Amino acid sequence: PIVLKLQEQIEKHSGEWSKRDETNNFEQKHETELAKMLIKPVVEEQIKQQV
Amino acid sequence: ARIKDEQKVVTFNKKKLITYWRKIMRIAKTEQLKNEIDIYSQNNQRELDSK
Amino acid sequence: MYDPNTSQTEKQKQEEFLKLKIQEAFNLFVKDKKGIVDKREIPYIMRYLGQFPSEAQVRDAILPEIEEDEPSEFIKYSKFEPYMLKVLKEREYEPDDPEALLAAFKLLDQEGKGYIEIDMMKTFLEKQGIEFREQETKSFIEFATNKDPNATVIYYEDYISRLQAFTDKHIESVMKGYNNFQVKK
Amino acid sequence: MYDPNTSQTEKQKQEEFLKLKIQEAFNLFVKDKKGIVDKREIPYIMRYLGQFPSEAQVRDAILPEIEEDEPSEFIKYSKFEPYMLKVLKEREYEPDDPEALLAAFKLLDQEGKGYIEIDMMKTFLEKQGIEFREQETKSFIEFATNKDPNATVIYYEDYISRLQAFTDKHIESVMKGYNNFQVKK
Amino acid sequence: MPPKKAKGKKKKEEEPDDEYKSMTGADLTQTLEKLKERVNEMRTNRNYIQMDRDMVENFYHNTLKEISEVKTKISNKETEAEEKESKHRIDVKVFLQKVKHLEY
Amino acid sequence: EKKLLAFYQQERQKINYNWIIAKKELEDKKSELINKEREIQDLQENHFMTLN
Amino acid sequence: ILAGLVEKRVAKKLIPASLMDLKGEQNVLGKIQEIQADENLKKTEALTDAKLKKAQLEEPSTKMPDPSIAQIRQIIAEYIAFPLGSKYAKEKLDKMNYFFFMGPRGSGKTLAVRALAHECNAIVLDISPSNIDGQYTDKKQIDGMINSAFKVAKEFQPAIIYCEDFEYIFGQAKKKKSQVNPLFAKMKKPLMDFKKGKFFEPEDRVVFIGSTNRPWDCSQKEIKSFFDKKIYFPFPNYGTRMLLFKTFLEQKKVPLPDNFPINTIAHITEGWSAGSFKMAIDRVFTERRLQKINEEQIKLSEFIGPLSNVPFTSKEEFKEFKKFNQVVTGLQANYEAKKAPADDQKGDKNKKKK
Amino acid sequence: MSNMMYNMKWQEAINDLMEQVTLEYLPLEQNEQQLGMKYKRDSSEWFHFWATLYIKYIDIYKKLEDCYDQLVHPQKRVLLKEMLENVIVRLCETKSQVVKYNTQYDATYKSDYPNLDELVMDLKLTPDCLDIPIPRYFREEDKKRLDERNQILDALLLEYTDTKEPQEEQYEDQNTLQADMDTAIRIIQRYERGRQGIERANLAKILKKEEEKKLERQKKLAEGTEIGEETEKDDAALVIKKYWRGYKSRKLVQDIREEELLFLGMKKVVEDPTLPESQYKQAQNKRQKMKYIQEEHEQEFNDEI
């Protein structure tokens, strides 16, 4: 199961960053687009709870 | 007290080896510096061509 | 260095020793041409092997025998190897026994202070016997006084002890490369 | 000095060596009459061989022991040598443990500074124990401070190291030649 | 307290009966010459290997030094590149603003 | 002395493999270095073209 | 509970240290050593003399290459810190919450415990006799001590419990009148009670380690049944002694001569553990001795006395260490499992019913 | 050279993780292909495979843990922490598998101390590569809980024993003699009295040697020996000169050896790590700045979220 988790997380890293351009991120700051993808579900869940 | 036919008096092999390999490594390092003659000449000529 | 108290095989071994130590010291003292080093380095070359030649000794016996028929400013190693071989075999210029220096400094310090003033040491080694140059005398005084520039006297006993220790250390280093050579078939 | 755990022949050889060193020490203070020295020199002849009796121990036992039935200001070497040989064989008055002296000096330096004030040491030696003469106190201070006039605190670790070196050198001088020591028939 | 070391009956070694008990004086002279230079064939192997190992370790130190130097100079070069790219960005902004100086 | 020889030979082998590691790392760093000079030169060309 | 443990010296912070503090060279000739040990075992298995064979088989398998310091550190890391410092590692790895440390004083037991606690940010709970002696005189008092130590350990993750000199709690009453308080051996009962209760959850970042300077005095069966894994810190080998000597010399910054007999001092120190080795080194090199070091070179005889004066471990203690480790770790069980012949059958065992 | 090397090294670590996963799967692929028959896959081969996988996973753990600790991207950092814990678990599983398969020498020793010397030599790796360093993220993660715990512990230490530092196991030296102060004084007194007696004997012997040498000199002088003194100092100086020439040549030789030691390689140079300009300390300031940058970057990422 550890090997399977490693494969899954490697695929995650690939699909998330291997096609991402790091030329403009000299200092290695957090990516705002990945932040948005991580953040949208929180608001979705809050709205779902209220409704 | 056994120090002159198979115990002690064999300084030469590897002390005359000390000096002979001093000769050999001097030759080899001079040859390395001569090879670096061409290496650094190519680098310098490229820089001048670059410059 | 050379020990003439051996059999035929060990005698040949020590002959080739003297030869090879000449070769190695010469190699360390060579500038351009293999097998030839300046006669001036001859005292230095063979002190590298364990000889204590007087400068007059080097001028009078070491050089004339090693030189060729015509006056030349260089020595062939092929020639100094036989001469230095005989020299080391006979131990003509090996560093004499250290109480020699002990008595030398005792005689120099005529006043029996337990030490010799730097000025007195300078006078003794510049006007008595073979004359040190300025560099030789200054370095002598420095090492004898333990690198104390402010000392007005030289601790001759301390210098003698340190000189004996350094002589033994370098002679051991030289004999590291004294011994082996096997009869080559 | 003496090795009491040798064979019969080695024990006899070391006994004779101890006798020779006893005679050497006794002659060290034999001043006017041969074979007898001042009983006050008895402690010093005693210490020459590596045995360190105290003044009280000397006066109580060593003085009367080698003194005739009628106490005498001088003690003959005839009586001195047997007791000296016995003591050398038994290591009776041999110097105390270096660790014992280290512990004693640690005690004196109650604060564990690594050094003991020379004033405090003088007070201890001249007012506690067998009070030293001022000369004895000065000699101890000199040996402990390495003859440092500016010294006021004695680093007991290196003082003990210096004492060990001096005692070892003296014992080696007394015991030398034993390997080349030959016993007559 | 000091536990005085016992005066045990000293060794008086009963000399082991090894192969060292079966030769005469001439056989000595021979075995002398048979172990007298060589055992320091071996000690000289030790000395030459010491020479070699010291040379090896100093050259490894040199290689690590070169690695660190190249790392540091790569860092300085990257800093220069970043600062000069910032200069390029500011120049681009300044020209897009010079679309204002030209307007004026 | 035999044990001394064995120990020193072991140390020599270890530090020889250390030669290998250190030299390969140095070569990698030098290749990165050259790539970075090329990067700076290309960036200079691009910036100059933009200025033009 | 944590404040009370601190007041009683139970709960504390150990000195910042790393497991690498265990100075020992990698087992360069480990496979060769194992091959030679197997060859020696095979040779001893073929003897014709019954008494000689029995004597050879009776001794602990000293032929086994003692674990290197590097191997000890690797095992400590994997089996503790991963369970200790990483909660996911603890959850998904071997669920062992107790370890037994064997080894001589200064061999690295206390040092390794402190290194684990510091590097994992684990607060330590030293319930060892050296830490609790003269403080507790009631069995109920010891019960409360153990309960509070375990509670603090579990609560303040990461937390570990340390019992140095483990041989004094699980001792045998059949022995003579032990100097250590039998009340201290009394901690064995609460330890078993807590272990059978399983207070340390698999995800809990807590482990109890019994470090003993006398594992032979420890119980082989009890150590088997109490601690899941056993870690043994053997005395420095030739290479380990060289590493320790060089490390201490560089720590004291004493210049090293070119032709200095470092290996010679290592051999003269052969059999000396790390702690005694460093004590002897420091005794040889004192502050004023350190000052004179620039004046006086290091001499081989400088350790002849100090080495004979610093505590030294007997080869009997070496063999006892090896025997107890081999037994407790189950090594002897594995050895015996393969040498049992299967010729004997299940025949008559009924006639002698009286 | 910090961030780009970090990213490339993380990419290489991921690639090695794929390589190890493929090396694990390949035995599975062969088994699926050819377990219509039975593989004579001996425990020796299985143990060798598991030891190789265990070493590879130790390396993968080390690299991934370092990347998680240093790489300044927090979005990267969280997943890197997760996968590092996964690698921890897989490495321990490989260790257990190696223990299981440790059937070398036809014996089933399932110990946790595998001797990987031969495998490391075959794979061309350092002996030090077998060393497993403890994580710093163990202290790092949830440090606020750990920070509070250690702060409370230090407060307890200060309030109880007045010292928050770790306690020291007392090395009670066995060389402490139980002697009185007067006992120490008199022991030193005996030492000094023995020394002074030795000195007095030596002084008497030296004095006696003085009279003996004076008598011998007087007898020699009466013997009509005309001892020249001029050449005494001259020969003294000459011998001093020969010795000094020897010493100067020796010092030249030793300085040549030292320079070979430095340049040609005969000597290491012990660099002072405490020096800020020392490569290590400069790059240490490097990580200090870069880790404060990482802290501020995680702060910025959280604020952006």
Numbering used by the authors:
A (entry chain L): 407 to 457
B (entry chain B): 52 to 102
C (entry chain i), D (entry chain I): 1 to 185
E (entry chain E): 1 to 104
F (entry chain D): 54 to 105
G (entry chain L): 509 to 862
H (entry chain L): 1 to 305
Quoted from the paper:
Here, we use integrated modeling and cryo-EM to model the entire N-DRC structure and some associated proteins from the ciliate Tetrahymena thermophila. In addition, we reveal that the N-DRC is associated with a network of coiled-coil proteins that most likely mediates N-DRC regulatory activity. We localized CFAP337 and CFAP57 and showed their interactions with the CCDC96/113 complex. We also find that the CCDC96/113 complex is in close contact with the DRC9/10 in the linker region. Our model implicates CCDC96 has crosstalk with the N-DRC. Therefore, the CCDC96/113 complex may function as a signal transfer bridge for the N-DRC that runs from radial spoke RS3 to DRC10 and vice versa. Our model revealed that the N-DRC is connected to an extensive network of coiled-coil proteins on the DMT that span the 96-nm repeating unit. Our structural model also shows that the N-DRC regulates ODAs and IDAs by interacting with a network of coiled-coil proteins. We hypothesized that the N-DRC conformation change during ciliary bending can be transmitted to the coiled-coil network by pulling force. N-DRC stretching can pull on the highly elastic coiled-coil protein network.
The N-DRC is a large 1.5-MDa, ~50-nm-long Y-shaped complex with two main regions: the base plate and linker regions. Here, using cryo-electron microscopy in conjunction with biochemical cross-linking and integrative modeling, we localize 12 DRC subunits in the N-DRC structure of Tetrahymena thermophila.
